């Protein structure tokens, strides 16, 4: 009648990805966790832009679109910042936004690349991921001699359900039943299908024998980060956020039951 007691086994951990196995859980939980990694882990991203000068060949909405996609280091600050809906300020304050400025003029015969290094923030813990101390900086725009770009921006807390700029992942690999023992997929010619990396079958066997009793019980994840959060912080934020969504729902449910 009761909860699962799931188990975790981390098999790889890097600055870019975490690979792990969850075992003794239900497929619905495993999928809702996968979904929360994409949609409902919050990060900081640029969401307000004001352009003072733009003599580049790209129109202002093109520049702003590109700025919104630049990933910002969010790890410990995003748990502190309010949403602008919950914050008490009139528009912006340090409690719900990070200010950015950029100011580049090309004065030389060589083409000036304008990059995520030319973004300067007012908060030293919220900076472009490429600016952290290799991978090059993200190209914003190229300026010819005499062209100029000058702008001010505010970055806000949000999550990928509102816009994909707030998605912290760069790919979530998810797999279960690597050898098709549950027959959830049914191959017309199993010998044609390449083995999963998680296969335990010998190379003469195309798929495991059918298990009439089994159900999905072991799930393989590779969570790759865009860099705004550490991969393990993506996972721990997702578990906290899903638990919070459930607790909020139970608070409203218990009020509704008391009202009846």
């Amino acid at each position: 009648p009761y909860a699962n007691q799931p188990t975790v086994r981390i098999t790889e951990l890097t600055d870019e990805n975490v690979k792990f196995i969850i075992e003794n859980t239900d497929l619905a939980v495993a999928n809702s966790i996968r979904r929360v990694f994409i949609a409902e882990v919050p990060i900081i991203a640029i969401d307000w832009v004001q352009i003072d000068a733009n003599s580049s060949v790209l129109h202002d909405e093109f520049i702003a679109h590109r700025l919104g996609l630049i990933p910002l280091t969010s790890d410990d600050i995003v748990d502190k910042l309010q949403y602008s809906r919950d914050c008490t300020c009139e528009e912006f304050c340090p409690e719900c936004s990070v200010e950015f400025t950029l100011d580049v003029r090309c004065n030389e015969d060589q083409t000036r690349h304008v990059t995520s290094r030319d973004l300067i923030s007012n908060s030293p813990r919220v900076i472009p991921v490429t600016s952290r101390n290799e991978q090059d900086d993200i190209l914003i725009v190229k300026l010819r001699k005499g062209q100029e770009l000058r702008l001010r921006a505010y970055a806000k807390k949000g999550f990928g359900k509102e816009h994909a700029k707030w998605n912290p992942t760069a790919g979530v690999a998810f797999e279960y039943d690597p050898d098709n023992a549950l027959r959830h997929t049914v191959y017309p010619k199993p010998e044609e299908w390449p083995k999963s990396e998680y296969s335990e079958l010998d190379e003469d066997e195309s798929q495991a024998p059918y298990d009439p009793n089994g159900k999905p019980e072991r799930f393989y994840y590779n969570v790759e980060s865009c860099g705004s959060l550490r991969p393990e912080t993506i996972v721990l934020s997702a578990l906290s956020g899903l638990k919070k969504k459930l607790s909020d729902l139970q608070t409203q449910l218990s009020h509704e039951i008391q009202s009846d």
């Binding site: 790209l58 590109r66 490429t130 090059d136 993200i138 190209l139 790759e224």
Partner: peptide, 20 residues
């Protein structure tokens, strides 16, 4: 026109990889 910041399909940053 200019290299997209993100891969449309999965969100990986590619806007720092073109000059390389």
């Amino acid at each position: 026109m200019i290299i997209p910041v993100r891969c449309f399909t999965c969100g990986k940053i590619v806007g720092n990889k073109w000059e390389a």
